[PDB]
Design a protein around this ligand. Sequence first.
Ligand code: ATP
Ligand code: ATP
Ligand code: ADP
Ligand code: MG
Ligand code: MG
Lengths: 28, 219, 393, 130, 395, 50
Amino acid sequence: XXXXXXXXXXXXXXXXXXXXXXXXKXXX
Amino acid sequence: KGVLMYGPPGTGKTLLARACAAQTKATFLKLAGPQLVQMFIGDGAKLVRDAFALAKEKAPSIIFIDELDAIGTKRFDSEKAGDREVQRTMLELLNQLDGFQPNTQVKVIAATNRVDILDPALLRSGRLDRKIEFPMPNEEARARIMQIHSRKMNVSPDVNYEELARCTDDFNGAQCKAVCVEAGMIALRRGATELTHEDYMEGILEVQAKKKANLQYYA
Amino acid sequence: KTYGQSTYSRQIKQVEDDIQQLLKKINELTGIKESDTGLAPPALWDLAADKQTLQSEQPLQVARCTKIINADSEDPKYIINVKQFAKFVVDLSDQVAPTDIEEGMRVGVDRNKYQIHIPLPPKIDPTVTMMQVEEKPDVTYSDVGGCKEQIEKLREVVETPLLHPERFVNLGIEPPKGVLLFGPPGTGKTLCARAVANRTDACFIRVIGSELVQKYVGEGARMVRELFEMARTKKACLIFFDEIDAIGGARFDDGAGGDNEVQRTMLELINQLDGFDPRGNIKVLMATNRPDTLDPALMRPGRLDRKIEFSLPDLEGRTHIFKIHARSMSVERDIRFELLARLCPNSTGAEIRSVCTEAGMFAIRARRKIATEKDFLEAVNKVIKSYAKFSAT
Amino acid sequence: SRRYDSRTTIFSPEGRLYQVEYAMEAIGHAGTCLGILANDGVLLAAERRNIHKLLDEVFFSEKIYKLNEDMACSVAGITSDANVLTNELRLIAQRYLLQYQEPIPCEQLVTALCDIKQAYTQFGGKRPFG
Amino acid sequence: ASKLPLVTPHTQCRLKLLKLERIKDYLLMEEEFIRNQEQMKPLEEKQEEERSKVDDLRGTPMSVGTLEEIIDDNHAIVSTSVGSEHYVSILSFVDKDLLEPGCSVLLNHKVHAVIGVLMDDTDPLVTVMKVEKAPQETYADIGGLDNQIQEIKESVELPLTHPEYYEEMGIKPPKGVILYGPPGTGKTLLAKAVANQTSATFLRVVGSELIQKYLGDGPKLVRELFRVAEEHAPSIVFIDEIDAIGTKRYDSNSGGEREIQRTMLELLNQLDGFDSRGDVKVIMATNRIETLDPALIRPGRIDRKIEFPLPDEKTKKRIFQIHTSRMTLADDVTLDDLIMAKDDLSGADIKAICTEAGLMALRERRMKVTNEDFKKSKENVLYKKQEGTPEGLYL
Amino acid sequence: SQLDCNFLKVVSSSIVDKYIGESARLIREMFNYARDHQPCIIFMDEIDAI
Ligand SMILES: Nc1ncnc2c1ncn2[C@@H]1O[C@H](COP(=O)(O)OP(=O)(O)OP(=O)(O)O)[C@@H](O)[C@H]1O
Ligand SMILES: Nc1ncnc2c1ncn2[C@@H]1O[C@H](COP(=O)(O)OP(=O)(O)OP(=O)(O)O)[C@@H](O)[C@H]1O
Ligand SMILES: Nc1ncnc2c1ncn2[C@@H]1O[C@H](COP(=O)(O)OP(=O)(O)O)[C@@H](O)[C@H]1O
Ligand SMILES: [Mg+2]
Ligand SMILES: [Mg+2]
């Protein structure tokens, strides 16, 4: 009877992937 | 450490806040009461602490807080929510103002309407040092205020403010401003340029808002 | 079985009925493509489908939207989050000018090299979009007859500075930026609200008073911020409140464990109304039925200046409201209304219009084409007897 | 001074009484009695509400209160609210005998009590008899 | 579809007879022109050629997004399943007309452009509150009102079924109707009877279920109720039992009762403040009428107030008949043993009798009907009333 | 002011967060930091929040 409330958060997860055939030099 | 304004709600408290911010050149920082109340939990303790860290980086700095009664409340046996975040942000305000790790590079001005809600922890002597009441304008201040707001308007120079201040009974600075505003438009109704004593007396009849009639069985 | 109501009754009907059936039977005969789980009908995209869609494929981009935190010196060097992807330090592309890229702005950023292309309008949540009225009802000032004093006071305040900012300059005053309206119900509060929203020349913004009470704390305050932020952008806008008793009337503290969240919301309305950096060009109208149990912080002038009341007029407003409501209907030319108004001394304009709508029912209690004065006599015969032995009265 | 009054005198907004109806529902609980006559003689039935096995029962008389040489009564309600009424009604029957030297008829004795019980409902805000 | 908007004669005027036969001519000739397309060049130009141009234009995997806002004509902002938002342009293949915010879309891979729309489901709130079908008995159930039937018919049904008389004089129908009287009269019956024989949608609302232990949800349920009722159809909103939820400002207290005040204050504005709702029929039912807030009672909100009395010996003879119309009846019973005697008891009491006689017979495993069934059932329904009565002797 | 190296102070109000865990996760890290340095002092003013 007439009572407020606060809240909360449930953050999702995250993930990434690639073909992984890229070289990272290009320097020299 | 800290200056508190309090009084009746029309005596002028936002004035000296805006006035001294107008005159000084330090980093003036505003803050309202219900801005510290947020939806999720935390978020005032985040908000108060980030507010003072901004005041440290700009070391000549003054923080003004208005409607401190919205967050300053004498705690008791409270259930559910509502208060169960408000006192949490209030304690963060107490700690980040005074006590552990003191500072001298920030000054706090607060102003309420009602005093008796507040904690003794807010009022202690080191959180808010000076306590400044604002009384209602007694006689001559009512004559003084109505002269101030009569600056721009075309006043016929046969007007005694002491006659006005004696008949403006129990007004505040907001109502004495309102009588000066209404008396200009009443002269605009009939197209007169200057004013009269009758113009102010009719403005007093409008601000007091006399409702009805047939009150004639007196005298 | 039945009878003709007017002469060729079915003869015009089935001529209309089968051609609406035939407008269907055109389309399936031509071949119609409907209900194809969310597409367009084929008659207008077959000449859209080809290479001026490839003009939207290859020249156009995706342009992922973002948000700006701050700027830097001598150069843009903008710090920007996406929303939940990563915060970046990025630059504008050359198609913009570095002027309207101010902070706290939703902007669109290229997906490949992360550069700014388009500034976007800010996030206005729809709950306050649905209270901007965006249309204006047809209510004339003449329709609120019987209120010659009350409209004239309200003309002076809401209307005249917004349409003549001249006389107030030439005398040197400030208009009374807020007006309260009150009185007994059914008297014309909402009429004057619609009639000013008619001739507004402004961004009229409706507010229902009980839309602020919510379940969570502080979110009811966050509405009031977004109102006065759009108010400072939409220059010279009007805001109408209605039934402000729900927004808050008292500060009950004897047993301070009752209502608090409405008090916090009501205090937020106090600060953004007056105090610390005034609002400029915003006028506020309020309307309640009991203007007695309100907080005197609202009653301070500067906030609520004029207390206009709405009474039951005398004897001649009723004759004029008769001439407002019973101009617009189909009656006999033998009208008189001083006879009618003297029979109902204490009545609202709602009770006036209730009689005029009751009067049309008697002609439909009968089988007539018209409204007779004697029928309207018999209309005012019953409603005197109806209001004498009414249930609530 | 004025906010502590209970207002047990005003009618109900329905247009009836408001406090007496609360009182009459206490009689239905805590007691059950009856009496039957059709010829020469009359009986009274009582019921022990508290029948615990550590009472004395040395009164040798009970709810039947012999108030006269020709009359008695059977009471149900608040217990010591009756002891005010039984001592009062016993003396009304006795001051009648002082006045006339003739025993009191059973009709007008009942009218003497019912004028007393009404008088607390008429005026004062005194708590009525349950 | 929206072929011609004119209806303005609205009668047997010759103007409509001319206009609609023009519309008959422009439609026949458009048909007879296009009939001679599949006669002389009967080509199938866009069976798959329209489709295979576009199914190859869109990607083969489709991805469902969500609308957030709509900007000028082609580019709008969307939201992916995780929250990444894209400022993509829509094509002229999707129905732009049913494209409102809060809807699922179909997207692309490279440019993520809006390709199509997925149709919506049915909201649960209709399935909660709407009496979905014609529930119960028709006007063969009611016992002889014939004037109360006449008022509700010309206020709701005859406006809805045959709107032609109001638009002759231009006079709008009255809006609100209050049903009131002593309890057990047939207030729920008359709502369901009109809900039986109707053509528009009907909504039943129990008023006691509008009090949440949270707060703000009082006005939240109200502002969604008329929102659904407006957006759905021609609608008739019935709210039973408003007497113990919306009475008046009796003490102006706080702590819950102030919340109940705010719910009725929203309902008062949601009933009638702004932009007259249109094709919304409001019917309200109470037991008590006196302790009601007069701001609801005023015209502009409710215009019809109908008393419900109790007949004594006349309509009961059918109410006793209708409740005994589907049961046995041995010849030892006369309904005039009970109809002629007492003159105040409700129609709900009559149903309470006519079920209890069926209870008393089959409990004792007997045959059809005795008189003593109706004797003991009438005696019981007396105690069903009287045992909750504190009345003594003349108050 | 004696130690000035081995003293932990907590306001006992900035512990709360917007997530579901993440307030315990501070407390586990605190005592584990108090586990690593051996003579530690914990100070939490104004428990009444937490
Ligand atoms: N002593 C005064 N001298 C001149 N003007 C005054 C005085 N007191 C009030 N005013 C007028 O009152 C207005 C500001 O109101 P005020 O400062 O009383 O609000 P407050 O008391 O700070 O806040 P609240 O109204 O919420 O209590 C100004 O426009 C100012 O002109
Ligand atoms: N003076 C008047 N002239 C013309 N019509 C009137 C007048 N007064 C009332 N009416 C009619 O009565 C109806 C009710 O008016 P309105 O909606 O302003 O009442 P209200 O003041 O909003 O009531 P409440 O105080 O309960 O909110 C209007 O639709 C209007 O047509
Ligand atoms: N005129 C009548 N004809 C048939 N049955 C009736 C009649 N009046 C009342 N009843 C019976 O009494 C009940 C009346 O319901 P109702 O009076 O609407 O309850 P409430 O008024 O408490 O909502 C119905 O169940 C119905 O069976
Ligand atoms: Mg102030
Ligand atoms: Mg209104």
